Amino acid sequence: MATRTQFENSNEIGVFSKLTNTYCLVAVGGSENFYSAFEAELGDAIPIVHTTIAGTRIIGRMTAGNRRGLLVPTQTTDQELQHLRNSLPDSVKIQRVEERLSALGNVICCNDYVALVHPDIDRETEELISDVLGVEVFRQTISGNILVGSYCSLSNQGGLVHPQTSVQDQEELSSLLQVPLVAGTVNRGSSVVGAGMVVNDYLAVTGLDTTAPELSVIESIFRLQDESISGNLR
Amino acid sequence: AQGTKFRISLGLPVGAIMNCADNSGARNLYIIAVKGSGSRLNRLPAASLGDMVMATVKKGKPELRKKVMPAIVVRQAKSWRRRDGVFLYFEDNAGVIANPKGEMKGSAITGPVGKECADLWPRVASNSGVVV
Amino acid sequence: XXXXXXXXXXXXXXXXXXXXXXXXXXXXXXXXXXXXXXXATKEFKGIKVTVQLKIQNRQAAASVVPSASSLVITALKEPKNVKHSGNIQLDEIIXXXXXXXXXXXXXXXXXXXXXXXXXXXXXXXXXXXXXXXXXXXXXXXXXXXXX
Amino acid sequence: SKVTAVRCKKCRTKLALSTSFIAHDPPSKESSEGHFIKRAANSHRIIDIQESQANCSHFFIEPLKWMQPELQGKQELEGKFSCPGCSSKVGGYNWKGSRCSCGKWVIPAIHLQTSKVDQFPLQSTALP
Amino acid sequence: IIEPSLKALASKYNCDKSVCRKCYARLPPRATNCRKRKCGHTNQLRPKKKL
RNA sequence: UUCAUCUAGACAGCCGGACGGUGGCCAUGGAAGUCGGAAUCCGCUAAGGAGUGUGUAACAACUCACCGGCCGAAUGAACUA
Numbered sequence: 179m180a181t182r183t184q185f186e187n188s189n190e191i192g193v194f195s196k197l198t199n200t201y202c203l204v205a206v207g208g209s210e211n212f213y214s215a216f217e218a219e220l221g222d223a224i225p226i227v228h229t230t231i232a233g234t235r236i237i238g239r240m241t242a243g244n245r246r247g248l249l250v251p252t253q254t255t256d257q258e259l260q261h262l263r264n265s266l267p268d269s270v271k272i273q274r275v276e277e278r279l280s281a282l283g284n285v286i287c288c289n290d291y292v293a294l295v296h297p298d299i300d301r302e303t304e305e306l307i308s309d310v311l312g313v314e315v316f317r318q319t320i321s322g323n324i325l326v327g328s329y330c331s332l333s334n335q336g337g338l339v340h341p342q343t344s345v346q347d348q349e350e351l352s353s354l355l356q357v358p359l360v361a362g363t364v365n366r367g368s369s370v371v372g373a374g375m376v377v378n379d380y381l382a383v384t385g386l387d388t389t390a391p392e393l394s395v396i397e398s399i400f401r402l403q404d405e406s407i408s409g410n411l412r
Numbered sequence: 413a414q415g416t417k418f419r420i421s422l423g424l425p426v427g428a429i430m431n432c433a434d435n436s437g438a439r440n441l442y443i444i445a446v447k448g449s450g451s452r453l454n455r456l457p458a459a460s461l462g463d464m465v466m467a468t469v470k471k472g473k474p475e476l477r478k479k480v481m482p483a484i485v486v487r488q489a490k491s492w493r494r495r496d497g498v499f500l501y502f503e504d505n506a507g508v509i510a511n512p513k514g515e516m517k518g519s520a521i522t523g524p525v526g527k528e529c530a531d532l533w534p535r536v537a538s539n540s541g542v543v544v
Numbered sequence: 545x546x547x548x549x550x551x552x553x554x555x556x557x558x559x560x561x562x563x564x565x566x567x568x569x570x571x572x573x574x575x576x577x578x579x580x581x582x583x584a585t586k587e588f589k590g591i592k593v594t595v596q597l598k599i600q601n602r603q604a605a606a607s608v609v610p611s612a613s614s615l616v617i618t619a620l621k622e623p624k625n626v627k628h629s630g631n632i633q634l635d636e637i638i639x640x641x642x643x644x645x646x647x648x649x650x651x652x653x654x655x656x657x658x659x660x661x662x663x664x665x666x667x668x669x670x671x672x673x674x675x676x677x678x679x680x681x682x683x684x685x686x687x688x689x690x691x
Numbered sequence: 692s693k694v695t696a697v698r699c700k701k702c703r704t705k706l707a708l709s710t711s712f713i714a715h716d717p718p719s720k721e722s723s724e725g726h727f728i729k730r731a732a733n734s735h736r737i738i739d740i741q742e743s744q745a746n747c748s749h750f751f752i753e754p755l756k757w758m759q760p761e762l763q764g765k766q767e768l769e770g771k772f773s774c775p776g777c778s779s780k781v782g783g784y785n786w787k788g789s790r791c792s793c794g795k796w797v798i799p800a801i802h803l804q805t806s807k808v809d810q811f812p813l814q815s816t817a818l819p
Numbered sequence: 820i821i822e823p824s825l826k827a828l829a830s831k832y833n834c835d836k837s838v839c840r841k842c843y844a845r846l847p848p849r850a851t852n853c854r855k856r857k858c859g860h861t862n863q864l865r866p867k868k869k870l
Numbered sequence: 871u872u873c874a875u876c877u878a879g880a881c882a883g884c885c886g887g888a889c890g891g892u893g894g895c896c897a898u899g900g901a902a903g904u905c906g907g908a909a910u911c912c913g914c915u916a917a918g919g920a921g922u923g924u925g926u927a928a929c930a931a932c933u934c935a936c937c938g939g940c941c942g943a944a945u946g947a948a949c950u951a
Contacts, residue, residue, distance in 0.1 A: 390809035409756040663912040732869040796899040
């Protein structure tokens with residue numbers, strides 16, 4: 179539902195991890211306490227895969243994927259590739275993508291149905307995003323920012339977007355995405371809301387410095403929220 | 413507050429004017445000091461890719477000018493060794509300004525971003541378009 | 545089963561007192577414990593000290609007032625420092641009252657028990673002017689009658 | 692108003708509901724109980740004066756059902772407890788006091804610090 | 820939670836000591852002179868401050 | 871050098887008891903001899919304070935004033951060079 183935890187001592191989670199519907203990816207250099215937040219609440223439903231991308235620990239920003247597919251940058255070594263295809267199930271498709279815009283997660287924001295991409299992405303790529311993910315591809319920028327990945331978190335239920343956005347611009351995105359949209363802040367007021375948190379249908383993990391008024395707004399638009407052991411025995 | 417980084421070659425002494433990559437109004441940065449530097453007689457403290465340096469803005473909006481504020485180096489023109497083997501170098505020097513926590517005032521970064529700068533600072537890795 | 549006793553001090557209207565600290569190791573009681581106190585301190589003032597001891601086993605109530613202490617002399621009156629220093633016509637009433645106190649006094653008859661009970665009341669006016677020290681130094685009433 | 696629920700941060704468990712809360716709301720504000728007094732070894736020597744904080748940083752709740760395995764097993768005069776799934780220091784029990792940060796006293800307290808737990812409404816969404 | 824039977828056991832070695840004013844040494848409580856030679860075996864002793 | 875205790879039992883330690891009205895009473899989250907202000911009483915007495923202290927959340931536990939035995943010849947203070 180709405181859990182809060184932190185990697186080594188940093189609040190942001192979507193930089194260091196990638197949460198999807200069918201799988202989840204985590205960075206390698208973490209405590210047991212960071213992994214226990216994912217292991218307890220997911221359980222044996224989806225595989226939690228330890229990996230690295232292009233010799234880094236920031237695999238949330240480098241990769242981009244959904245239920246059906248996973249895209250990795252060109253700089254991904256072949257040893258890191260085969261470790262992914264083994265642990266992830268047979269259904270997901272894994273493809274290396276030749277980009278000038280290397281970091282795919284900042285460029286691409288997507289879910290089961292609708293993708294938003296950075297507008298300077300080229301035409302031969304836009305076929306490969308639709309072919310792998312099975313998703314219609316739309317070019318748009320959140321009000322001031324070309325980077326749709328870091329400044330717009332999205333899921334099947336809804337979407338949390340950049341705070342400095344006009345209502346008429348939020349209307350035009352809502353028509354295109356066909357989901358309701360809420361502006362908010364995460365991690366005591368950081369505008370970086372796509373990398374500040376991760377989300378899917380069952381779970382939404384945020385930083386520890388997210389205050390409770392911010393976490394209440396997050397759980398509302400995602401509609402994740404819903405007791406006998408509490409009782410009065412004096 | 414600086415995380416562990418493997419040593420790369422020191423290529424920006426005190427007095428360097430590097431470009432300003434983000435879109436917070438500024439056009440260049442005048443480096444005055446480098447956080448975490450050592451001490452030796454007659455040695456200028458130098459910057460590298462990934463270091464957090466103190467810098468003033470010489471050219472830009474007048475709100476930004478005339479105040480010292482720390483900054484993160486995102487490109488380096490001096491070549492350096494990566495452990496996998498290659499020697500690589502960018503075309504120019506570059507930096508982004510930041511608050512002393514390490515959060516970034518800039519909304520986005522133009523041009524390429526050094527890979528070692530991305531892992532060391534998370535907020536740079538959020539705003540970065542291209543990482544090498 | 546088990547037999548345990550604890551003691552409760554003061555309180556007029558309602559007070560957790562000793563029991564809350566002592567009720568921790570025992571069965572936890574908040575509503576009934578002050579109610580068991582409220583059964584005992586009924587028709588007793590709140591300003592006055594009231595000494596009790598309650599023996600419970602599986603949430604039992606025991607209401608008693610032992611009154612070996614100054615509770616007896618405090619019982620007869622009508623209510624920086626609210627002074628107790630009053631005059632009372634103790635002599636006939638206190639002789640019945642000290643016999644209520646002297647269940648063991650561990651002395652001889654009521655005469656030795658009258659020289660200690662009046663000394664416990666170091667505040668009240670007693671019989672006529674003074675009922676303390678040189679005035680209650682000799683007692684020529686009751687005496688052998690209560691024996 | 693509506694009922695409120697207290698969920699644990701990083702455990703996501705409803706620790707205590709409403710129909711609780713012995714909140715004790717007004718402070719004393721006079722010199723001996725609104726002020727924190729730090730005495731010395733002898734002769735009631737006052738060395739430090741600390742003014743009380745604004746809001747009481749705790750939640751004073753009744754003894755509940757999920758504290759019963761901790762309260763009965765190794766009963767003592769003071770201690771602490773946790774969320775039942777993450778084992779972090781969430782609140783402590785004290786039969787003494789520990790007034791509030793803002794200060795009165797209470798009765799025996801089950802003090803539940805407002806840091807590292809938060810308060811939610813149990814009712815439907817606000818729909819902003 | 821300290822169970823003050825044990826605190827009185829603990830206070831003998833830590834708290835119930837005397838302190839020399841000059842050399843700040845931790846001396847036995849009923850001692851008259853300091854055992855250290857650098858302060859000249861002085862008799863100017865104070866109690867250790869209680870918490 | 872000058873004083874004072876001492877086989878009429880010293881100093882040191884040991885060995886007994888330290889009880890009854892006692893959680894007295896105002897004092898306030900709680901103070902029971904010990905955070906304290908004013909009061910200072912009786913009983914059992916060989917003798918024992920509404921209490922010299924350590925300590926206790928509040929008690930306790932210990933210790934002391936005091937009461938009687940044993941151990942048995944030296945002990946204490948202020949100085950001067």
